[PDB]
Structure formats: structure tokens, C-alpha cells
Nucleic acid binder design. Structure first.
Ligand SMILES: [Cl-]
Ligand SMILES: [Cl-]
Ligand SMILES: [Cl-]
Ligand SMILES: [Cl-]
Ligand SMILES: [Cl-]
Ligand SMILES: [Cl-]
Ligand SMILES: [Cl-]
Ligand SMILES: [Cl-]
Ligand SMILES: [Cl-]
Ligand SMILES: [Mg+2]
Ligand SMILES: [Mg+2]
Ligand SMILES: [Mg+2]
Ligand SMILES: [Mg+2]
Ligand SMILES: [Mg+2]
Ligand SMILES: [Mg+2]
Ligand SMILES: [Mg+2]
Ligand SMILES: [Mg+2]
Ligand SMILES: [Mg+2]
Ligand SMILES: [Mg+2]
Ligand SMILES: [Mg+2]
Ligand SMILES: [Mg+2]
Ligand SMILES: [Mg+2]
Ligand SMILES: [Mg+2]
Ligand SMILES: [Mg+2]
Lengths: 373, 435
DNA sequence: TGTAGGTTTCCATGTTGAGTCA
DNA sequence: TTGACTCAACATCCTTTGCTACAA
């Protein structure tokens, strides 16, 4: 998960983004930020007591620390069981204008249910929430997760994320396939160019979060050279570059073992294999390379002298599919595309692409295979 | 001579050179933003070059019944807008502006998108179209995403879905149009191509200064009823009165000791902010310098001490001693003083921090009369259709912006009563009251 | 204000529509 | 349909009361 844009701390050097991470010299600060969060302490006491640190250290970093650590804690509503009804039954007694009368009213209320409701009036809001347990965490893990979140916040604005492979090739392309990501496989240096969130009209959130999942997967590796082309600017947007590699100062935590188990792919596999025995199927054929441009289909379907490369697509736009068909127009195989309903529905070049909603209708696939018997 | 006008995802394109366009190679034709149609067409229709327009793709306008018994100034507004069908109407909050817009779209009989800031105004416009027009308008934004006939939308949803909806709705309506000249909403208005445009507001004047772009975006003010003047068939006679509070002699020590830091900081480094419109240079220094942000936050806390001073509470008690049979709405600057008042005088608060159901429920019981006095933190400036009152107290100036006085001192829409407004300010400090 | 300049605004607090999870 | 939670966009943020009075 990422942090808010007004806490993204970074610089530009000659049209090149440089994220300001946290070195070891700052651990001290982090220590206090964990030592301030005690069990049974309210958020108001916390922020009020860290105004002194913001005058000393970088305020954006202090906010980042406190924001994350509050995201980790376990909060209590409050000790009184009626958090809101207090004001329900207490404000009905008009505007009080004398201190003796106000104490009379508070005693009548403390009789009506019985509680110390002179301090528990306004609960059920941010500042008054208490802590049930202090979350266990060390300072180094905290700075690692801050750095990872800063990097993800930066990449959230990117136009393309080019990832350079080191040893593992098939694993990351399988991840990209069952994360719906939009990729182009090029083999000039053997790289993958993933379309960034800035290519979506209004879908950016799920796609950026899935791209971040693939990112945290990439960080556990031998080396990870990435050259993310970013799009920054609130008034006007300029394009920048963000290079980074071998930065082994990030978090090696939970990987979300099951985010997407490719139910669509296995459904299509067991549907195609057990409905007709005239057309062949290949699990993952070797990618077809054409002039340094790698095309990775999902299945090959060949029956004699008619072989087709079918590929299913997750997140998609009009520009993406147009460009993919233009590139694959030189693959010497009739390319079949399967679109999910996740943008403005299109039907251009119907002789190459078919759409579905939840699962793949094997009937449509066979009708299209009979259109080119 | 022969030239073709076309639209694409928020842009207009043609062949002949019209004033306001620019050559483009990706489009192979002179392209500009769509909002220039209502002008460039008039540039070609006058040149007698028989241009065909293929941009108007209005959805089928459903037949609507007119059941609006409009007043006379409303008809004058309708005439003043109908001259060129491109303008802005300024009428104080609660002068039946929604009815005026509905009568205008009834006369137009052409598809329309009404863009409103809040979900509250979505519901108000939907209910008033169901009442005064007998039609269920498409509700895009918020819960639903229905797009039929005459449609209403949020500014946010109209910006995120702008190129998807630009070639539709030949007429546009902007309730509370002072929210349109923002960063993204200006772009939103520019991507649309509606030749007919109407903006609605109560206070059009922005302390921001970007309020010049109106003729470029929707047109000029064609009719504004004199603000806070016609009080016979409007709300009762405005009775603004100020109360000056002697600031606490204990609080004054810290106040002066706290503004001395800012004064000595600005005097020692130059960069005088006195009569300087650019307060942004000081925050640009504050983002990197330590004492810069230190002295600036000290200034901010000093202004906080000034506006939320406890001495003013005393005069509040005084006023509540005097008025015990009138509906009182007390305003404040920040949540801090709002909840301080709520704890001292047993009054329900309404801020953004309070939830939706609780907010609506306190409004319900305020209308019923069970709650006589209520306290809110500026959250009632909008067109939420909050029940009016008679006495309206102001404890947070919130600057000299026309919104927090005109659009706030216009939630009193009753008659046959006193209906006075009080501004409780401390004389020692800023007290920068509206001019 | 204009015959030059490269660039993410954003010291605070307030509001709210929109869009993500379990 | 809810209810969390966030988060981007949009807002304010500015110079000091004093010799002409009305109350609209
Ligand atoms: Cl920033
Ligand atoms: Cl570097
Ligand atoms: Cl540094
Ligand atoms: Cl007592
Ligand atoms: Cl066979
Ligand atoms: Cl009639
Ligand atoms: Cl109906
Ligand atoms: Cl005006
Ligand atoms: Cl006039
Ligand atoms: Mg090192
Ligand atoms: Mg050590
Ligand atoms: Mg007694
Ligand atoms: Mg150690
Ligand atoms: Mg083709
Ligand atoms: Mg679906
Ligand atoms: Mg009737
Ligand atoms: Mg009547
Ligand atoms: Mg006035
Ligand atoms: Mg005093
Ligand atoms: Mg300045
Ligand atoms: Mg409800
Ligand atoms: Mg949805
Ligand atoms: Mg937004
Ligand atoms: Mg702003």
C-alpha cells in the first residue's frame, strides 16, 4: 500500500526523478515514533505530542511514520457502551445557561444510565480512539516499508513501467498474465514494457494496485532494473524517468499467495480440451519473436494446416488493443483475442477479437474457429 | 469555402481557419477545444460558406409538462438569458433559482445536463424535476449511473466522464456556478461543446480572482437581482449587527508573544508580506526552511487564538440570555470551537466529522422544532436545503470571502419576523470583516 | 506583464464525491 | 444496499479600527 501524494518527498535532477528515501541515520526518529504509540493511548495525545518533532525533523516523514503505524494498530471505540446516544438524550435538554444547572443535568444523566460521561461525550471520532494493543514492529522494517510505499506512490503516476529481467523469465510473465496487466514483450535487451496507470480513463486504482503487487514480487529477485517513465504535475504534466536497480532496502513481507488463481485460464483449458478433439491445444507455446518484438500468446490451436495463437486479455483500452493487433499483424498466425468487459466496449477488427463477461463461452470460440475452417 | 466541423473526445476540428484554432498534424485539421463551437459556427454562418455541423448528437428529449408558476423577476431572468442563451443568473440562496432553470429547460425543450457540486443538490434537483416537471432524470454520479433524457451529474463525475459525454446535452446548467472556475472544473467546462449554457449562483464574486473566465466558459452575467436589496418578496429585512469582544488579558500575552516571532522573522529577512498578495512565497520557503514554517505556524496559531478566543463565549451567553423564543444557528471557524460550544452550552454540532445519518437526523429535528439552537462549522454554506432560522450568529469570520457571508447569511429565508444576524469578533486582532 | 530559460505546488485545516475491500 | 476507510480536488491563507453624519 502507498501513502498520500502530499507526503511523497522527491526531487528532480535534469528531467530525472530521484525519490528521497530514509537512510540509517534516521532510525532514531523511527524509534521514538514507535515509542510514542503506547497501548491505551489516544490519537489526539499522539499528534499533539509530535508537533515538537515536526519542528525538528522533516514533517512529511513524521506524518508518513505516524500514518503507517496508525494503519497497523488495533483501535478501540471507547469505554462507554453508548458512544452516540449520550448526545441524543443530553442535547434534548435545551441550551444550558448556568453552571449549577449544567451539573444538575449531568448528574441526572449519570443517574439515567450511570457512567463517567463527563469525559466520554464525543467518542466515535479520530482523536478519541484508544489503543487495544501496541503493534509489534521494529524500526528497520518501518523504514523499509516507508521506502517501498514511497516508491509505489511514485510508480502510481507512471505511463510505462519497463522491467529488465535478470534470471527468471517465465515466472514474471505468468504473474503478469494472471494479474491482467498490459504488457509488451520486447527483446532488444529482453525487457517487458508494462502500460502504467496513466493509460486508463477511469479504472486506474485496481490496475495500479495489481502493478504494485507485481512490483513487490519483482523486489525479491537477483537484480531488478526498472526504468519507469513517470507523468507528474497537477497543473501541467511533464514526463520524467525513474531508474532504479538492486535497491535491497525494501520489505520482504507477505506476498499475497492467492490474489488471482487464473480461474478463467483453467476454465478455458478444461472447456477446450473436453468439448472437441479436432483442434489441438498447447499449455504455453514458446513465444513467437518477430524483429526483436516478443509475442507471448497463451494457447496454440492447430488442426493440420491451420494454427492460431489465442490470447486472453485483462485490463484493456482501445489504444492498447489497436497497438497489439498492429504489432501482431506480422506474427504469421491468426491471432485471437478475448476481451473482458472493463472499458468502453468495442467491436473493431472482429476477425481477431471476441468479448466475454465473466467466463469464456467455448461456443463462440468454436464458431470463430469455424469462420476460418 | 466548403469546410466540415467534427468532434472528438473534447475537441472540435475543421478545415478552414477560424479565430481560436490551431493547426494539428495528428488530426490533419485545425483543432481547438470544443467550447468554441458556439462561436466558430457563428463565425462560419456569418461568412456564408454553407458549413455542415455534425457535432450535435442530442439524445431524444422526452416530452415534459410545465407546472411552474414563475414570478416576475424569474421571467426577466428567462428573457435576459434567452437573448443569446449563454450566461449566468445571480440570485440569493433560496430565490427559486432551481425553478428558473427548470422553466428555461422547459422552454428550450432540448436535452440537458445539470452539473451540481454535492449529492445533496443531486437529490434536490431530482425531487424538483419530479415535482415541477414530472420526470425522473438520469442520476449519474453517487449511487447510480443512470443516463437518460435530462440528466444530472456531479462536477467530479462530469470531469472524470467528460469526453464520454461531451457530444451530448446541447444545454448545460451550473447550480452554484462559483465552483466551476477551479483547476479541473475549468477543464471540464472547456471539454464540453454545448452551445446553450446557463450558470446559476447566489454569490458569483470570488476572492480567488479567477472569476474572470465566466464569459469564456459559460457567458457573462445577464441578470443579477440586486443582492440583499429586494426584501418584500424575498427574505425579511437583513439586520447585520457586530459585537466587539475585549480579548482576554491572559490570552493577550501569548498572542503578542506569538505574533512577535512572525514580525521579527519577516523584518529580519525582508520579504515583506504587508500588503503582499503573494502569501505563497512564504510557504515555498516554509517547505524547506525550519524557522520559516515555525514562524508561519506560529502566525496561524495566533490567528486561531484570535478567532476562537474564550472571551467571546461570555457574550454568547449574553445573547442566549436575550433570545429564548427564536431559532438560533451559531457558526464558528473550526471544529475546535464548535465542539467547545457543544460541550459548554449543550448544542448539537454538525461538521464533516459527524456522520451522514446523524447530520440528516439533527437537520430533521431542527426542522421539527425539538432542537431550537444548533452549532455548525461553516458546513452549511452550500445549498444543502437546511431549514432557515431567525437569529444567525457568526463566531468565525473565515475571512472576507463573499461566500461565508452572502452564501452563509442567506440561509435565512422566512418572513414576518426580525431575522437578524450577529458577527461576534474580537477588536484586538485581524477581524478581517467582509467589505 | 512578454522579446527567455530548465520543475514535481502545497507551512495548515476543512468537505466532500468517488472508489477501493472485506 | 450498506459501512467503513482513505485520497484527490478545492478552499482559505493578506495589509489594522480613530474627526461625516444615515440605520437600508
Ligand atoms: Cl508535493
Ligand atoms: Cl541517483
Ligand atoms: Cl537532507
Ligand atoms: Cl455542586
Ligand atoms: Cl478431427
Ligand atoms: Cl399557460
Ligand atoms: Cl414520474
Ligand atoms: Cl452581482
Ligand atoms: Cl445596478
Ligand atoms: Mg547505502
Ligand atoms: Mg544498533
Ligand atoms: Mg446546588
Ligand atoms: Mg539493529
Ligand atoms: Mg490485423
Ligand atoms: Mg464485470
Ligand atoms: Mg396544479
Ligand atoms: Mg403557491
Ligand atoms: Mg449586505
Ligand atoms: Mg478583558
Ligand atoms: Mg508574501
Ligand atoms: Mg441511512
Ligand atoms: Mg461500480
Ligand atoms: Mg476527486
Ligand atoms: Mg489550491
Amino acid at each position: 500500500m502507498g501513502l498520500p501524494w502530499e507526503l511523497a518527498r522527491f526531487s528532480i535532477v535534469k528531467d530525472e526523478v530521484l525519490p528521497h528515501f530514509a537512510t540509517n541515520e534516521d532510525l532514531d526518529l523511527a524509534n521514538e515514533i514507535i515509542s510514542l504509540f503506547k497501548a491505551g493511548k489516544k490519537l489526539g495525545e499522539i499528534d499533539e505530542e509530535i508537533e515538537y518533532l515536526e519542528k525538528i525533523y522533516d514533517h512529511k516523514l513524521v506524518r508518513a511514520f505516524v500514518k503507517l503505524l496508525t494503519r497497523l494498530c488495533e483501535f478501540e471505540l471507547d469505554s462507554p457502551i453508548p458512544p452516540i446516544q449520550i448526545r441524543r438524550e443530553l442535547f434534548k435538554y435545551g441550551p444550558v445557561l448556568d453552571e449549577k444547572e449544567r451539573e444538575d443535568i449531568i448528574q441526572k444523566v449519570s443517574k439515567k444510565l450511570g457512567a463517567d460521561i463527563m469525559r466520554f461525550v464525543f467518542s466515535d471520532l479520530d482523536e478519541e480512539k484508544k489503543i487495544i494493543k501496541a503493534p509489534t514492529i521494529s524500526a528497520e522494517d518501518l523504514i523499509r516499508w516507508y521506502n517501498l510505499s514511497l516508491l509505489q506512490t511514485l510508480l502510481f503516476k507512471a505511463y510505462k513501467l519497463t522491467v529488465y529481467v535478470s534470471s527468471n523469465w517465465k515466472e514474471i510473465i505468468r504473474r503478469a498474465k494472471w494479474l491482467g496487466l498490459m504488457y509488451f514483450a520486447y527483446d532488444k535487451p529482453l525487457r517487458f514494457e508494462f502500460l502504467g496507470p496513466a493509460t486508463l480513463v477511469k479504472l486506474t486504482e485496481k490496475y495500479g494496485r495489481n502493478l504494485a503487487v507485481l512490483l513487490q514480487f519483482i523486489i525479491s529477485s537477483q537484480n531488478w532494473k526498472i526504468e519507469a517513465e513517470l507523468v507528474l504535475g497537477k497543473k501541467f504534466k511533464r514526463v520524467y524517468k525513474l531508474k532504479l536497480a538492486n535497491f535491497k532496502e525494501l520489505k520482504e513481507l507477505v506476498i499475497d499467495e492467492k490474489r488471482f488463481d487464473s480461474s478463467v485460464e483453467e476454465k478455458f483449458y478444461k472447456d477446450f480440451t473436453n468439448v472437441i478433439k479436432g483442434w489441438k491445444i498447447i499449455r504455453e507455446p514458446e513465444p513467437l519473436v518477430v524483429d526483436n518484438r516478443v509475442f507471448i500468446p497463451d494457447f496454440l490451436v492447430e488442426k493440420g494446416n491451420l494454427k492460431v495463437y489465442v490470447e486472453i486479455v485483462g485490463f484493456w483500452t482501445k489504444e492498447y488493443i489497436k497497438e497489439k493487433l498492429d504489432k501482431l499483424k506480422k506474427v504469421k498466425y491468426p491471432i485471437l483475442i478475448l476481451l473482458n468487459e472493463e472499458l468502453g466496449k468495442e467491436k473493431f477488427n472482429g476477425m481477431n477479437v471476441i468479448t466475454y463477461k465473466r467466463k469464456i463461452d467455448i461456443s463462440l470460440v468454436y464458431k470463430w474457429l469455424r469462420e476460418l475452417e | 469555402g466548403s469546410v466540415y466541423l467534427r468532434y472528438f473526445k473534447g475537441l472540435i476540428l475543421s478545415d478552414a481557419y477560424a479565430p481560436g484554432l490551431k493547426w494539428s498534424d495528428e488530426l490533419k485539421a485545425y483543432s481547438a477545444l470544443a467550447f468554441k463551437y458556439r462561436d466558430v459556427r457563428k463565425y462560419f454562418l456569418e461568412k456564408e460558406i454553407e458549413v455542415e455541423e455534425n457535432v450535435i448528437d442530442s439524445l431524444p428529449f422526452p416530452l415534459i409538462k410545465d407546472k411552474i408558476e414563475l414570478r416576475d423577476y424569474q421571467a426577466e431572468a428567462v428573457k435576459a438569458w434567452l437573448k443569446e442563451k449563454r450566461g449566468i443568473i445571480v440570485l440569493p440562496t433560496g430565490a427559486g433559482k432551481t425553478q428558473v432553470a427548470l422553466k428555461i429547460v422547459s422552454i428550450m425543450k432540448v436535452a440537458t445536463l445539470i452539473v451540481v457540486p454535492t449529492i445533496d443538490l443531486i437529490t434536490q434537483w431530482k425531487e424538483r424535476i419530479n415535482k415541477y416537471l414530472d420526470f425522473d432524470p438520469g442520476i449519474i454520479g453517487g449511487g447510480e449511473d443512470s443516463l437518460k433524457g435530462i440528466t444530472v451529474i456531479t462536477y467530479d463525475s462530469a470531469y472524470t466522464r467528460a469526453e464520454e459525454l461531451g457530444n451530448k446535452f446541447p444545454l448545460l446548467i451550473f447550480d452554484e456556478v462559483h465552483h466551476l472556475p477551479s483547476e479541473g472544473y475549468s477543464i471540464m467546462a472547456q471539454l464540453f461543446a454545448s452551445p446553450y449554457r446557463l450558470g446559476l449562483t447566489a454569490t458569483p464574486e470570488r476572492d480567488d480572482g479567477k472569476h474572470e473566465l465566466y464569459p469564456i466558459l459559460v457567458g457573462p452575467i445577464v441578470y443579477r437581482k440586486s443582492v440583499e436589496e429586494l426584501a418584500g418578496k424575498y427574505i425579511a429585512k437583513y439586520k447585520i449587527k457586530k459585537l466587539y469582544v475585549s480579548l482576554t488579558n491572559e490570552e493577550k500575552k501569548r498572542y503578542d508573544g506569538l505574533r512577535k516571532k512572525l514580525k521579527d522573522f519577516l523584518s529580519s529577512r525582508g520579504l515583506k508580506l504587508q500588503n503582499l498578495d503573494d502569501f505563497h512565497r512564504l510557504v515555498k520557503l516554509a517547505a524547506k526552511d525550519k524557522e520559516a514554517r515555525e514562524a508561519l505556524l506560529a502566525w496561524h496559531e495566533s490567528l486561531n487564538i484570535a478567532v476562537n478566543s474564550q472571551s467571546k463565549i461570555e457574550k454568547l451567553r449574553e445573547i442566549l440570555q436575550e433570545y429564548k423564543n427564536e431559532k438560533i444557528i451559531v457558526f464558528t471557524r473550526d471544529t475546535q470551537m464548535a465542539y467547545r460550544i457543544s460541550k459548554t452550552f449543550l448544542i448539537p454540532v454538525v461538521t464533516y466529522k459527524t456522520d451522514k445519518d446523524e447530520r440528516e437526523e439533527i437537520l430533521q429535528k431542527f426542522r421539527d422544532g425539538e432542537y431550537r439552537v444548533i452549532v455548525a462549522s461553516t458546513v452549511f454554506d452550500e445549498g444543502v436545503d437546511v431549514p432557515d432560522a431567525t437569529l444567525a450568529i457568526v463566531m468565525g469570520g473565515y475571512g472576507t470571502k463573499r461566500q461565508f457571508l452572502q452564501r452563509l447569511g442567506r440561509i435565512l429565508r422566512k418572513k414576518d419576523k426580525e431575522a437578524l444576524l450577529i458577527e461576534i469578533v474580537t477588536k484586538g486582532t485581524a477581524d478581517y470583516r467582509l467589505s
